[PDB]
């Protein structure tokens, strides 16, 4: 009942997914070997959301791993939780995309997409009631963006009425390590705007800022960024797995947060993030959780909400707490910052509460904003796109694989349409 | 006999039902596992529990309840909780996604695949019933399930039974506080079922009870358990006359006869007077006059609306405990002497009084104090229209731009139905305004 | 100002059998022949229990000739002048949409008269201009385009590309150059044969896809010398599938989603039309929300005449459907006045 299929594509997606499965297995008390060693009957009650039974008491996560080079597969299989996955679910080619969207979408990925879809069908048919899918990838890369969007298109064609989620890692203006990020990002967004119901935008710059400043980490690695994204991913789908006072599945969040079919790009966040040294010098209460939640510097999307207006907000709390305090705090946030909320929605906050906090924390919270400010991100990419498209800086690599300039122009026009649509509601009215 | 069938729809309804059945089991001395040790210890044979419970050969008592939800979390909570052994195993769930907070999904798309089971179980319960009085339906306007599936269920019940009473206990959305974005749409969409099918709908909002808990009970951080316990106390006060002997009993039929003046005007407010903590239980007489005066304060109203901005059109006072009729008459005379409490000219009688000898019961671990006397006041007044108006405005602010409408029309709803529900609500508000004018 | 979107709503006349079997109740009381949808003015209809204002109200006696002469004749003048033109058709089941848009051989429909007068006009203008006509017929179904005249084409071929010169030009669409209205109707019937359909309720042939007919007229000089000035125009005839409530549906499944998509498409179209009529929302119009609105991106603005034939019925069996249709028509121009 309400069981989710998880798909991973590319290096970034595979790493985030490995960390996510580690976090979820720890939350549900699952051994690395796949056996159960919990200390509470509630963990086992709804374990079938993410896991499948196996005869010798074992639990196999319902994950599908995709790539075009076997290096990341070998790295994940040799990791601490490598043995947990099903060996058959590992799908991979031999010729990498090479940071080329066309190779990932048209030339190389078209061969592997059939096998990936067959594995997806095998996993989804055995499910009792399929809540929906959950992809993890990055739009600035190669096989990730292209093969991801191809899989989203195929699954949307095959499963039109199931919720789709993609935890995309957007490119950053400062922290960029691939020359052709604008082309890949634009071409992937052109598909994501059409074939998804949610898209939790994540940016490496924001995560680095959170690690440096909020957490006071001296030497962050990709493990910590994956840790934060994993915390968000676990927080979002908490109401399916555990009891609460205001349950809210993925579809409820989609209905509450998406006013129009195209505006489904969200800024996530995780509230209780503090350094180890500073833990004792502060309490753990709902008002300060909220204050950290709505802090403009705690967002993972690298967009300042102060430069826009919140179309909608969703807050998912976890732990024993009073509903009066939560409602009073959300009302205070809405009334105090009325300039950052749209006038034509009486209430911009969708609240949910779960009774099980995550392991060694008295209570935590997760934030899902949907604000106009995200358009600035696209604007940035669009600028870089035109800066490389008027002269055709690296276009021959893409046209060699069967693309055309008309597809690039279509993607740019679609992104501009999206930006204009977001800017429509930012103006006072 | 005097049976009543309880139905609970959605998370809010199911949790309110949990509180209600906790209170009922405490009232009648029934253990959580269904057995009543008093009959074995003393002999019994003269108790009154047929209103809610039904016996079996082995002495187990099963409640006359139907718990309905479109997702299994809350009902699985009940199935594995303290009262797992109490209910019949027919606690019905949809093994699929819930309505996800929209009327169209709950009413048209996914709510039609369980309605057959719900109606079959209601029919089976009614077949065991020989003196059925009415249906007590618990739901919430804001939720997709509590609106859509409640509408469908009440439509089917009106088609099937028709002549039997139907009472609603709903959680209306609050003015400012809210826990969802599309509450106004669902609340307006429930207007048709509330008007055409329900016989008397009692409305509640979380904000008013939060204020009551903050002020009276001295609870700074209240959760839904306290709200559910208070609503359970009110519901128990309503149905107390069907279970215990009293000086002036009040059954549901006469209740509606003297409460509802016109067919469309069946939306009374409800309140409970002696809401007081154990610390404040002392330092107070809590006489009949005191509690009766406390009923009429604007602060103690359980719906966030001002009674002073409207004329009272009917009132029913249900007393429990050590209450004498002469004291009640003196209290009502005192209330009529007051000037702020305005009554419509076409209702000279004004008040109805019922008295019961069973004092209120205290749930162990609950925050209400043990008292000798209590009174529950249900008042049909024109103030509630104001509440409708504010929610009405919210609907307009979201319907001018057709925000969130694509989700609703993607699940079988037509675009034109929204305006129809809006016009029905406008007509209802106009009727409530019209009845308040003095005669000429 | 004058605007470009006009609403003309027509009332279907009673059939003999329905009138005979439903007027008995009216005769006895004064059966459901209450004449619910009556007329009091050419631009106002208060006989629905409420007041609606429309650009044109077409009564029971209105036959096809005056229908054509009033609703769509200026569109031919506009398209021959060199500006796009569009005519929508909307009406629930049993509302006479097919009778009005198509008709029978005894009573020619709107398409027959429009094509006939277009052919006569180009015949008259042949002496000074060379004019040719290109016909295309496509279906929108579950947000996917299909070529009705050239079936077996994969759905992924037919896509929309935004031309730099304000043209859509859906790719891989079969094109035809008929020379007379007769073969135009033969092509239309060929396309309608390929139209997606399925039995619903007691009806066996309920259409469940939007249909679009595009007539591209290309003109050039004959008795003169010029370098490049053709300014070819487009006339669009759009048939919109009627809305539907799941409550009527019982089988669910693929019929559900299909129906749901139809509703979504209609909603999107309505918003676009409203967004075009209100001057305040001129900053952005939600063209991208559906395939149809994207296909008509440049065929609804102020520089192109758009009309909508709304077909209703006066019977009581379709009272709710007729009220919904009237409300949808009011969405285009919400001039709430009494
Ligand atoms: C004694 C004590 O307080 O220990 C804490 C701790 O010190 C703090 C600083 C923890 C700690 O987190 C971090 O320092 C951190 C570093 C990089 C990236 C992310 C976090 C902690 O590592 C994190 C860890 O959190 C958890 O166990 C959560 O359940 C978390 N799961 C994991 O971290 C985890 C990761 C891999 C394998 C197994 C468990 C989680 C969070 C959200 C949703 C699901 C699970 C805990 C208890 C602590 C330490 C260990 C120091 C914090 O935890 C989180 C996840 O926010 C950081 O701010 C909180 C506040 C805590 O006080
Ligand atoms: N008084 C009271 N109200 C509650 C309780 N739980 C939820 N609510 C109310 O329920 C309203 C929203 O309904 P939902 O939470 O969506 O529950 P639902 O009616 O089953 O709707 P779905 O969950 O979508 O099926 C909120 O505005 C709450 O005020 C409760 O325990 N007590
Ligand atoms: N959070 C996170 N981001 C990563 C990691 N590895 C790469 N990235 C990001 O992903 C982008 C490169 O995409 P890549 O993984 O190479 O795409 P692929 O080649 O198609 O798999 C860079 O901009 C990085 O910022 C990782 O381990 N964690
Ligand atoms: Mg629910």
């Amino acid at each position: 009942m309400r069981e989710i299929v998880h798909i991973q594509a590319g290096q970034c997606g595979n790493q985030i997914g490995a960390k996510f499965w580690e976090v979820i297995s720890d939350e549900h008390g699952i051994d690395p070997t796949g056996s159960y060693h919990g200390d509470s009957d509630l963990q086992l009650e709804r374990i079938n959301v993410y896991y499948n039974e196996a005869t010798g008491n074992k639990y196999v996560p319902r994950a599908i791993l995709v790539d075009l080079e076997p290096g990341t597969m070998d790295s994940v299989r040799s990791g601490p939780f490598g043995q947990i996955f099903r060996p058959d679910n590992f799908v991979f080619g031999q010729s990498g995309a090479g940071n080329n969207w066309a190779k990932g979408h048209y030339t190389e990925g078209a061969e592997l997409v059939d096998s990936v879809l067959d594995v997806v069908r095998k996993e989804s048919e055995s499910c009792d009631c399929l809540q929906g899918f959950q992809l993890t990838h990055s739009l600035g890369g190669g096989t990730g963006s292209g093969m991801g969007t191809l899989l989203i298109s195929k699954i949307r064609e095959e499963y039109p009425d199931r919720i789709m989620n993609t935890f995309s890692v957007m490119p950053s203006p400062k922290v960029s390590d691939t020359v052709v990020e604008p082309y890949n990002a634009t071409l992937s967004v052109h598909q994501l705007v059409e074939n998804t119901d949610e898209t939790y935008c994540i940016d490496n710059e924001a995560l680095y800022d959170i690690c440096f400043r909020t957490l006071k980490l001296t030497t962050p690695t990709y493990g910590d960024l994956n840790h934060l994204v994993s915390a968000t991913m676990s927080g979002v789908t908490t109401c399916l797995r555990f009891p609460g006072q205001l349950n809210a599945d993925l579809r409820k969040l989609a209905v509450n947060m998406v006013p129009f079919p195209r505006l489904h790009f969200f800024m996530p966040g995780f509230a209780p993030l503090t350094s180890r040294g500073s833990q004792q010098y502060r309490a753990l209460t709902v008002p300060e959780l909220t204050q950290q939640m709505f802090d403009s510097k705690n967002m993972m999307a690298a967009c300042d909400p102060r430069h826009g207006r919140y179309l909608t907000v969703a807050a998912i709390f976890r732990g024993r707490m009073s509903m009066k305090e939560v409602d009073e705090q959300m009302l205070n946030v809405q009334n105090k910052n009325s300039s950052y909320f749209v006038e034509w929605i009486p209430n911009n906050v969708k609240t949910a509460v779960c009774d099980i906090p995550p392991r060694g924390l008295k209570m935590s919270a997760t934030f899902i904003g949907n604000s106009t400010a995200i358009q600035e991100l696209f604007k940035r990419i669009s600028e870089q796109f035109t800066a490389m498209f008027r002269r055709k800086a690296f276009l021959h690599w893409y046209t060699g694989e069967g693309m055309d300039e008309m597809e690039f122009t279509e993607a740019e026009s679609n992104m501009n349409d999206l930006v204009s649509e977001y800017q429509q509601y930012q103006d006072a009215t | 006999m005097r049976e009543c069938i309880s139905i609970h729809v959605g998370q809010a309804g199911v949790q309110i039902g949990n509180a209600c059945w906790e209170l009922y089991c405490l009232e009648h001395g029934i253990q959580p596992d269904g057995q009543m040790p008093s009959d074995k210890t003393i002999g019994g044979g003269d108790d009154s529990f047929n209103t809610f419970f039904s016996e079996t050969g082995a002495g187990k008592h099963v409640p006359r309840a139907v718990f309905v939800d479109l997702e299994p979390t809350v009902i699985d909570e009940v199935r594995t909780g303290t009262y797992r052994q109490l209910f019949h195993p027919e606690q019905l769930i949809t093994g699929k996604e819930d309505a996800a907070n929209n009327y169209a999904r709950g009413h048209y798309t996914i709510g039609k695949e369980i309605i057959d089971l719900v109606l079959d179980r209601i029919r089976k319960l009614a077949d065991q019933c020989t003196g059925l009085q009415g249906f007590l339906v618990f739901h919430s306007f804001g939720g997709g399930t509590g609106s859509g599936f409640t509408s469908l269920l009440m439509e089917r019940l009106s088609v099937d039974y028709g002549k039997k009473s139907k009472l609603e206990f709903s959680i209306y959305p609050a003015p400012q506080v809210s826990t969802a974005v599309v509450e106004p749409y669902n609340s307006i969409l429930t207007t048709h079922t509330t008007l055409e099918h329900s016989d008397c709908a009692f409305m509640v909002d979380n904000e008013a009870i939060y204020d009551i808990c903050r002020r009276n009970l001295d609870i700074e951080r209240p959760t839904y358990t306290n709200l559910n316990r208070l609503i359970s106390q009110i519901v128990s006060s309503i149905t107390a006359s069907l279970r215990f002997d009293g000086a002036l009993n009040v059954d549901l039929t006469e209740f509606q006869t003297n409460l509802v003046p016109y067919p469309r005007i069946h939306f009374p407010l409800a309140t409970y007077a002696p809401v007081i903590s154990a610390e404040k239980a002392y330092h107070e007489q809590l006489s009949v006059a005191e509690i009766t005066n406390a009923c009429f304060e604007p602060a103690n109203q359980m719906v966030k609306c001002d009674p002073r901005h409207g004329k009272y059109m009917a009132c029913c006072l249900l007393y429990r405990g050590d209450v004498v009729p002469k004291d009640v008459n003196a209290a009502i005379a005192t209330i009529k002497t007051k000037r702020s409490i305005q009554f419509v000219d076409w209702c000279p009688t004004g008040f109805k009084v019922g008295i019961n000898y069973q004092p209120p019961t205290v749930v162990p671990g609950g925050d209400l104090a043990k008292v000798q006397r209590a009174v529950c006041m249900l008042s049909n007044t024109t103030a509630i229209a104001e509440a409708w108006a504010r929610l009405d405005h919210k609907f307009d602010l979201m319907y001018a731009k057709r925000a969130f409408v694509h989700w609703y029309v993607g699940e079988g709803m037509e675009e034109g139905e929204f305006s129809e529900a809006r016009e029905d609500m406008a007509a209802l508000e106009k009727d409530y305004e019209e009845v308040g004018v003095d005669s000429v | 100002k004058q605007s470009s979107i006009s609403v003309a709503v027509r009332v279907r006349p009673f059939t003999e059998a329905e009138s005979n079997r439903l007027v008995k109740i009216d005769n006895d009381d004064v059966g459901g022949l209450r004449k619910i949808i009556n007329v009091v003015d050419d631009r106002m209809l208060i006989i629905a229990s409420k007041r609606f204002v429309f650009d044109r109200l077409f009564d029971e006696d209105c036959t096809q000739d005056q229908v054509y002469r009033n609703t769509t004749q200026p569109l031919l003048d506009s398209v021959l002048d060199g500006y796009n033109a569009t005519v929508f058709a909307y009406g629930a089941t049993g509302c006479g949409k097919t009778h009005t848009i198509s008709g029978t051989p005894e009573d020619p429909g709107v398409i027959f008269l429009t094509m006939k007068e277009l052919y006569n006009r180009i015949e008259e203008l042949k002496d000074t201009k060379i004019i040719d006509i290109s016909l295309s017929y496509l279906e929108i179904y579950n947000e996917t385009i299909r070529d009705l005249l050239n079936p077996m084409t994969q759905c992924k071929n037919l896509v929309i590309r935004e031309d730099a010169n304000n043209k859509i030009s859906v790719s891989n669409l079969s094109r035809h150059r008929p020379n007379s209205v007769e073969e135009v109707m033969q092509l239309i019937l060929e396309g309608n044969k390929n139209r997606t359909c399925s039995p619903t309720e007691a009806n066996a042939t309920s259409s469940r896809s939007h249909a679009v007919l595009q007539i591209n007229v290309i003109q050039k000089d004959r008795t003169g010398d010029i370098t490049e000035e053709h300014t070819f125009a487009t006339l669009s005839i759009i048939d919109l599938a009627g809305s539907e409530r799941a409550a009527a549906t019982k089988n669910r499944g693929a019929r559900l989603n299909e129906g749901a998509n139809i509703n979504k498409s209609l909603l999107a179209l309505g918003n676009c039309i409203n967004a075009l009529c209100d001057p305040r929302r001129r900053n952005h119009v939600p063209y991208r929300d559906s395939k149809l609105t994207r296909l008509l991106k440049f065929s609804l603005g102020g520089n192109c005449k758009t009309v909508m034939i709304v077909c209703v019925s006066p019977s009581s069996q379709h009272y709710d459907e007729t009220l919904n249709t009237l409300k949808y028509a009011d969405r285009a121009k919400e001039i709430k006045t009494k």
Side-chain angles (χ1 to χ4, degrees), chain C residues 74-298:
Chain C
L75 304 188
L76 294 173
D77 305 344
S78 151
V79 83
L80 295 161
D81 191 58
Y83 297 88
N84 295 303
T86 304
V87 48
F88 298 89
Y90 184 26
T93 309
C95 296
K97 176 165 63 55
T98 312
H99 198 298
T100 297
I101 196 170
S102 310
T104 83
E106 287 80 353
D107 44 0
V110 176
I111 291 155
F112 192 107
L113 295 158
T114 47
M115 257 57 165
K116 192 166 174 179
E117 204 278 345
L118 179 56
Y119 270 99
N120 293 343
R121 271 282 263 280
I122 64 179
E123 288 264 291
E124 277 123 31
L125 266 288
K126 219 87 208 144
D127 273 28
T128 59
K129 301 288 196 330
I130 301 113
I131 275 145
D132 49 329
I133 294 287
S134 184
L135 190 143
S136 79
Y137 207 59
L138 70 183
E139 149 167 320
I140 288 156
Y141 175 91
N142 292 16
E143 296 323 77
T144 59
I145 292 154
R146 285 160 52 74
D147 197 343
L148 294 165
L149 303 174
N150 195 326
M152 191 182 350
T153 312
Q154 306 301 284
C155 46
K156 64 63 154 163
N157 326 113
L158 311 177
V159 306
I160 287 152
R161 57 185 73 265
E162 164 48 307
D163 197 350
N165 298 319
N166 317 326
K167 279 300 311 317
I168 308 321
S169 171
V170 171
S171 81
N172 306 112
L173 217 174
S174 72
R175 304 282 284 288
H176 304 71
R177 295 172 149 83
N179 204 159
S180 74
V181 64
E182 280 62 26
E183 54 189 337
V184 166
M185 257 72 171
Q186 297 313 352
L187 281 156
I188 286 156
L189 296 215
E190 170 29 73
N192 293 2
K193 196 180 277 290
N194 285 315
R195 195 170 174 176
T196 313
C197 216
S198 62
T200 60
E201 315 94 21
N203 177 260
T205 57
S206 301
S207 63
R208 300 181 61 82
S209 325
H210 305 276
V212 174
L213 202 157
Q214 314 207 280
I215 296 298
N216 303 318
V217 65
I218 295 145
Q219 36 168 30
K220 57 202 171 70
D221 200 342
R222 165 185 227 111
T223 57
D225 53 335
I226 54 176
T227 180
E228 204 280 340
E229 310 82 345
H230 315 272
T231 183
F232 92 124
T234 304
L235 187 133
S236 299
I237 297 208
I238 311 201
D239 167 35
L240 301 165
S243 61
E244 124 164 338
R245 56 177 49 184
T249 321
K250 218 55 52 186
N251 52 18
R252 208 76 72 265
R255 317 327 208 181
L256 195 275
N257 305 336
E258 181 179 359
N261 275 286
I262 288 192
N263 295 4
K264 281 184 189 181
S265 179
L266 288 165
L267 171 52
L269 176 55
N271 289 359
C272 276
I273 290 155
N274 181 265
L276 284 164
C277 278
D278 199 329
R280 289 174 290 176
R281 277 296 325 291
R282 65 193 180 284
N283 260 296
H284 169 67
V285 184
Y287 285 116
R288 295 261 173 171
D289 282 25
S290 53
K291 290 273 172 63
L292 187 132
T293 39
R294 203 180 164 196
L295 176 54
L296 314 171
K297 183 164 170 181
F298 295 95

Side-chain angles (χ1 to χ4, degrees), chain A residues 66 90 98 104 126 140 174 195 227 306 320 334 339 352 384-385:
Chain A
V66 192
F90 288 71
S126 80
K174 307 302 195 25
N195 304 333
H227 201 319
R306 302 190 297 266
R320 291 257 317 310
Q334 278 185 80
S339 96
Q384 295 183 328
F385 187 90

Side-chain angles (χ1 to χ4, degrees), chain B residues 52 124 149 286 332 439:
Chain B
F52 286 121
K124 277 197 179 85
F149 191 79
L286 305 174
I332 288 168
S439 297

